[model samples]
Every structure is written in C-alpha cells, then in structure tokens.
Target: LQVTISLSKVELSVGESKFFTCTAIGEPESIDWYNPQGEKIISTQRVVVQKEGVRSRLTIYNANIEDAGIYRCQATDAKGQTQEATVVLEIYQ
Candidate 1:
C-alpha cells in the first residue's frame, strides 16, 4: 500500500484556513492525521478530521503561527502495512 497527501495551501497568513487531504492507494484499514507536535488530531471546534474508506481530510480554521510545521498523514492497509506522507504548513503574520 502507498500513501499520498495533497494540500490546499502551503503558506497562509494568520486567521486563514488550511486544508490537507490524504489518500491511500490500496485498500486501507485506517487513515489518521497528526499535528505538527506529533500528536494525533481529532475533530474539534476549530479543527476537523474526516475519514472515509481510503481517504482522510484535515482542516484547520483561523490558523495561527503555532500551526506552522510538518503535518503527517498515516495509513494502514489490510495487510497491516503502514505508509505515511507529510506536508509543510507555513503560517505568517
């Protein structure tokens, strides 16, 4: 299995929104997103996580400077194979 990620914007000003999408090439058992701090991201008031089948999406509203970093998307396939991809987010004042 393979994993790929796409971003709506790599650079954004504070208060702007960000979007990240991840897709698993093969049959995926699960897909997850991690924040810049290497913590698992879950759905929140300002953040959203959507997972369906082989695809997952992460959205951040009113991004701040602290949101700038390398975000990770991980996927596990039916065979227990894991793959991941990263995208950088640059938040500027």
Candidate 2:
C-alpha cells in the first residue's frame, strides 16, 4: 500500500487554520494521522479527523505555535503492509 499527504497551504500563522488530506492506494484497511508530538490525532472541537474509505482529512482550526512540526500519515493494508507520508507545518507569529 502507498500513502500520500497534501496540504492546503505551504505556510501558516498563529490563529490561522490548517488542512491536510491523506490518500491511500492499494485498498488499505486503515488510515491514520499523527501530530507533531508523535501522538495520534482524534476528532475534537478544534481538531477534526474525517475518514472515508481510502481517504482521510485532518483539519486544525485556529492553529497555534505548538502545532508547527512534522505530521505523519500512515496506511495499512489487509496483508499487514504499510506506507506513510509526512508534511512539515510551519506556523509563524
């Protein structure tokens, strides 16, 4: 399986929003997002994660300086094969 990530913007500022889309090919079983802190991201009031089939979207509303870092997207197939992609988020004051 192969996974790719796309960003809505190349740069961001404090209090702005961020958007990410992860796409998985090869009929992956699951797709997930990880934050800059290496923690799994879950849908929250400000942070939302939407998953539909082979695609996943992550949205961060009113992003802060703490949100700036490398984000990772991972996809796993039925056969246990996995692939991942990463993107860097830079938030300026």
Candidate 3:
C-alpha cells in the first residue's frame, strides 16, 4: 500500500494561505507529518489535519517562504507496514 498527497499552490500574494492533503490506501496505525528540516510536526500551524478512514489532510492557513519547500506524510500500521508520500509547497508571486 502507498500513501499519496495532494497539494495546492494558489496565487498566494504574500499573506494568503495554502492547503495540502494526505491520503492513504491502507489501514494506517500512525499518521505523521514533517517539515523540510526533518522535524516531526504534531500539527500544522497553517493547516488542519484530518483523517477519514484511510485518508488524511494537511492544510495551511498563511502561506510563506518558511512554509515553502517539501512536506512529507507518513502512514504506519501496527503490522509494521509503512506508506508515505511527499508534497512540495511553494509560494508563487
């Protein structure tokens, strides 16, 4: 099983927000998010994390350069199964 994430890069004119979603195709035991620095984020500041069955989402409220770059999503099951994906967040002027 694999995890796939959806990313939206809106025309955020400096203070706008962006939304990114994480989705999986298996029964994940754990859902985790990380920044480009490899630090795990308990929750996204600008985005909301949602889980519905095998699906999840990460949303961003205020888009910025610090928010830019690569974001990774990891899904792990109790059976030691791991699925993950990565999405790049960029600000387009």
Candidate structures ordered by lDDT, highest first: 2, 1, 3
Q: What would the TM-score be for candidate 2 when compared with the true structure?
A: 0.87
lDDT of 3 by residue, 1-93 (tens): 454444543344557865566665566778877877797765645567766666666667776666777778898989988877887766665
Report residue 51 deviation for candidate 3 (angstroms).
Answer: 2.6
Clash number for each model? 0, 0, 4
Return model 2's CA RMSD, one decimal: 3.2
Mind giving the per-residue lDDT tens digits that candidate 2 earns over 1-93? 454445534578899996788888778899999998989898999999999767898998998988888888999999989899888888898
Encode model 1's per-residue lDDT on 15-71: one tens digit a residue: 999767788777779889999899999899898998865678799999989998888
Query: For this target, which candidate reaches the highest lDDT against the unseen true structure?
Result: 2
**lDDT, each prediction:** 0.85, 0.86, 0.68
Task: List candidate 3 stretches off by more than 4 Å.
Answer: 1-13
Q: Which pairs of residues collide in model 1?
A: none
Error of 3 at 29 (Å): 1.5
Task: Please estimate how well model 2 matches the true structure, expressed as its whole-model Cα lDDT.
Answer: 0.86
